[PDB]
Symmetry: none
Subunit: 87 residues, 2 copies
Amino acid sequence: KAVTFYEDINYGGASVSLQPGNYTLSQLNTAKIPNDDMTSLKVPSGWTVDVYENDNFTGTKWTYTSDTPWVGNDANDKMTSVKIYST
Amino acid sequence: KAVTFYEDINYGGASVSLQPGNYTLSQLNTAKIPNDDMTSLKVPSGWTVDVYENDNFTGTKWTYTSDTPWVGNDANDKMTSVKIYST
Ligand SMILES: [Ca+2]
Ligand SMILES: [Ca+2]
Ligand SMILES: [Ca+2]
Ligand SMILES: [Ca+2]
């Protein structure tokens, strides 16, 4: 049970799974998730994922609460930091 | 009435008690709680403890709301910062 971020549409390409927490760009990069590269994600039922356009949970924020095969053009390849809640 | 963090399993070893607040690594170190050393903890009923893998409330976050004699292998010896709420 985790959030999995995918590099291409429809859960294709490289993928990394994360547990709840508040992840800066530095931490994403260590977890092998590159800057501005997230296109789809799987979110466990009851969890919340707050994707931020800029580092340290700033800039525009997109919220996902279910599996999302396509984040849309505005949010695509924009993730630089992310907060994940098991709520 | 406080949260007490223990260095070994089943509330054994060195222990430090803290009141609600948001504690960075620096502050934990001053309170005599070393980095990456927490294995069990006591949480007062109604309180919440958010344990963070990295400093300044970032990285993976584990949540405890009751006495926990064993934090588990993934969370063991990982506390670098912590938020404690009397709620
Ligand atoms: Ca991509
Ligand atoms: Ca970005
Ligand atoms: Ca320990
Ligand atoms: Ca740590």
